[PDB]
Design a protein around this ligand. Sequence first.
Ligand code: HEM
Ligand SMILES: Cc1ccc(S(=O)(=O)NCCCOC(=O)Nc2ccncc2)cc1
Length: 440
Amino acid sequence: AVALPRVSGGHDEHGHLEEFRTDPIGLMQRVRDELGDVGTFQLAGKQVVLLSGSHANEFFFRAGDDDLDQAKAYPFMTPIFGEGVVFDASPERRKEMLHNAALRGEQMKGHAATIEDQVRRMIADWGEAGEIDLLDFFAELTIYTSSACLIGKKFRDQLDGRFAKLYHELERGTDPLAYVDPYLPIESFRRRDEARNGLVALVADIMNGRIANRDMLDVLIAVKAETGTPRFSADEITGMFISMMFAGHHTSSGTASWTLIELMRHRDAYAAVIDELDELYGDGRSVSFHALRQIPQLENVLKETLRLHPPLIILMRVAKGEFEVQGHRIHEGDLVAASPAISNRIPEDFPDPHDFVPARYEQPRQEDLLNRWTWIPFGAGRHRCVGAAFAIMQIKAIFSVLLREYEFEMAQPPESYRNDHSKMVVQLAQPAAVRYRRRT
Ligand code: HEM
Ligand SMILES: Cc1ccc(S(=O)(=O)NCCCOC(=O)Nc2ccncc2)cc1
């Protein structure tokens, strides 16, 4: 019956939702600044209990779904999974099935080689010098890396830029209004639905083309119902493929962009990384060898990039019961959140938190490992990212190629590179123009 502390503002139609669209990080920081480790904001009808700091975060992260349910806490995903089911099982098991085969350790070497090949294909027409836009380049690249590694090379070879453009529109269909209802009649939700239909059509075209001529798609095409009719539709297959690719796409795209941006903004780190790559690859071993092993300067740059630019800025649960955190009572049904954007910059935990300091992660310091509940770009505890090893290998593979072949410079002011945080799926804003030139 007692209400939790509530952050200032929130006087718009849907409470704090309008501000959560326009400046979610400022809102979440204001919750912490005004209220401390436990505070709330209103997302339309829903109260969000935002936790921060090590103690409250530990509660959040160590909770299992019996206490804090993650399954229903990201409703923007519902229209993405859609209605089709290919492999019928419990929600939890269907989730395992999306990723686990491809994430097996024994598959990593092959993925690193695949990723290398995709990067070389993407830069094949670059020539001596030119300009790219980071969102256009990395969003497309990571469609190819994600499809080739998760679904198969044969399938990726039938994809082109159209798939990437449509997938982007799908990701843009994640407005926080989805906590109201992900099927509301707003333009971005409409464009999401149209884009999903376009992706189904691309897959149908691929399926039809193959009939007239044994990757995962071949297997699924061949499955017959009792009468001989094919068991699976293009919609069912497409829904599964879209869902298999989703977690790794926006995160790899953004993380690659921000890793390159931070390298360009910090040319001392960039120089150190180049030297390290040149020396390491001087043993003559392939990217499929090195991307699975230590590349310390690059890895520390990546860790610091993830600290400053975590691709998921808020993590969500639905409380399944009542809990007390620092004397504040969370009630059944409450949305409960933790924020990597805020936690990753707590000044007690990360000295000079707004500064890019890859040395934070060197062996004597290890600020990532020390701050178990507040260095959280991959989450922590029960639901810690199962894709982290893959994601880190992929950055190492991508930059092993890019940084040895080309030199990069910012074509716009360094301060002008920024994210669009208006959707639950964060994307780099445009323009993000960058010059390249072949290394001599
Ligand atoms: C830099 C890249 C990535 C980042 C920053 C990232 C971030 C995160 C975060 C913050 C969580 C915790 C979510 C929560 O607590 O609710 C998480 C969990 C998860 N991630 Fe990622 N992720 C990345 C790459 C990937 C990839 C490549 C995959 C699959 C190929 C993936 C699949 C998953 C899955 C399945 C979970 C849930 C694990 C569980 O519930 O036990 N992630 N990730
Ligand atoms: C397909 C899928 C992927 C991740 C999950 S989850 O249990 O982590 N729930 C979060 C759903 C929204 O995730 C999301 O929007 N992005 C994401 C990227 C990388 N890792 C995790 C999440 C659930 C389903």
